[PDB]
Amino acid sequence: AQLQLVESGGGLVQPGGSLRLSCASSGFRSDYYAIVWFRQAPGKEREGVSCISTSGKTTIYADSVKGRFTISRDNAKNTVYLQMNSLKPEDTAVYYCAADFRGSRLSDVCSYSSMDYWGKGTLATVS
Amino acid sequence: FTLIELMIVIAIVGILAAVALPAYQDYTARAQVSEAILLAEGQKSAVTEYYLNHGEWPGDNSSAGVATSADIKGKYVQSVTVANGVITAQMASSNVNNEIKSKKLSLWAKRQNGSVKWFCGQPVTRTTATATDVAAANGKTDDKINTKHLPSTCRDDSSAS
Ligand SMILES: *[C@@H]1O[C@H](C)[C@@H](NC(=O)[C@H](O)CO)[C@H](O)[C@H]1NC(C)=O
Ligand SMILES: *OP(=O)(O)OC[C@H](O)CO
C-alpha cells in the first residue's frame, strides 16, 4: 500500500514537435490502479488531460487535447505512455502522473477526482 | 443343484461387481456451486444502497464499498467481481470438480415500479452504469457454468424481465 510513481521523458521542443511521457509505478498490486495524467500551467490551476482504465479498453481525453494525444498501457513493463503530436505554444505546463485505486483488474471507470498517490512531476516547455 | 448353477451364480456375482454408476458428478458440482452462490449473495446489500442513493449502478468494487475481487475467496471460489451492478463469481482451478473448473455464474437485478427483482444464472454483462438491459457474456473462452450444474431456481435467461 505504498505505490510510488516516477515520471520521465520531458524536454524542450519547437512547435509542431512530438514528445513521449512515461510513468513507472512499482510496488504491490500496481495493476489494480487507474493512471490519470494532469497538467498545471503557471498562474492557473491544475486540470485533467487524459485517463486510462484498469482493463485498458476505456480511454478518455480533454476537449483541448482531442485528436492530438494518445495514451497506452503496457503491464509487462509497468509503464504508461502518453504521446503528444502537433504541439501548441499554449501547452507549456508541468505534467503530473497519479493513480486511483479500483478493486478490480476488469474495470472501466475513469475519473479525475479522489486521487490517492501522486508524482513529482515533469517539465515540458515548447517555444 | 449342479456345477452349472454354481458357475451361473459366479457369473452373476461378477456382473453385479462391475456395474455402471449414475452421473454423480453433476450433483457434487451442484453442491459446490452453492458456495459461490452464497458468497455472491452477500454483496447485494452494498450495491442496492449505492444505486438508491446515487441513481446509477456501481462501476467497480471500490464504488460499491466491497473488498478486493481477489480477496473474496472460499474453499472452491477464487474471485467475486462487481461490474456495472453485476456480480460474477469464478470457481477455483485445482481442487474442484472436473466439470466446474474455472467457470463463472452471475447475479444481476432489474428495477421495477414497485420492487427490485433479482435474477440468478449464467454470466451476463451490462454496457453503461445507467442502463436497464443485460446481454450474454460472449467471452469466447468457455467459462460458463452448464445448466446441469445449477439449481432449477438459478437458470434465468439474459432476456428475463
Ligand atoms: C463509482 O463508480 C461509478 C460508476 C463512478 N461514476 C462514474 O463513472 C460517473 O457516474 C460516470 O459514469 C464513480 O466515480 C465511482 N466512485 C468512486 C468514488 O470512484
Ligand atoms: O480483479 P478481480 O478482483 O475482479 O479478479 C481478477 C481475477 O479473478 C483474478 O482472480
Side-chain angles (χ1 to χ4, degrees), chain A residues 32 103-106, chain B residues 61 68 70-71 78-82 90:
Chain A
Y32 283 70
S104 190
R105 317 145 44 84
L106 326 159
Chain B
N61 295 46
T68 325
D71 289 335
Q78 80 170 130
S79 297
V80 168
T81 290
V82 168
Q90 184 166 29

Side-chain angles (χ1 to χ4, degrees), chain A residues 29 32 54 100-109, chain B residues 59-63 67-68 70-71 81-83:
Chain A
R29 292 152 153 177
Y32 283 70
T54 317
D100 205 356
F101 184 57
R102 319 238 72 94
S104 190
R105 317 145 44 84
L106 326 159
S107 172
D108 270 326
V109 170
Chain B
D60 5 52
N61 295 46
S62 200
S63 289
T68 325
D71 289 335
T81 290
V82 168

Side-chain angles (χ1 to χ4, degrees), chain A residues 3-7 23-24 36-38 46 94-99 115-122:
Chain A
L3 175 93
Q4 294 163 353
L5 306 115
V6 164
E7 313 99 292
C23 192
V36 195
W37 280 98
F38 278 75
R46 240 201 286 273
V94 193
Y95 287 84
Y96 304 100
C97 164
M115 230 79 48
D116 303 21
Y117 307 130
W118 275 101
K120 36 252 209 330
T122 167

Side-chain angles (χ1 to χ4, degrees), chain A residues 100-102 107-114, chain B residues 50 54 56-64 84 128-130:
Chain A
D100 205 356
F101 184 57
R102 319 238 72 94
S107 172
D108 270 326
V109 170
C110 243
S111 153
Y112 290 123
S113 176
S114 303
Chain B
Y50 187 91
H54 282 270
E56 61 194 355
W57 295 101
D60 5 52
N61 295 46
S62 200
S63 289
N84 272 338
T128 52
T130 36

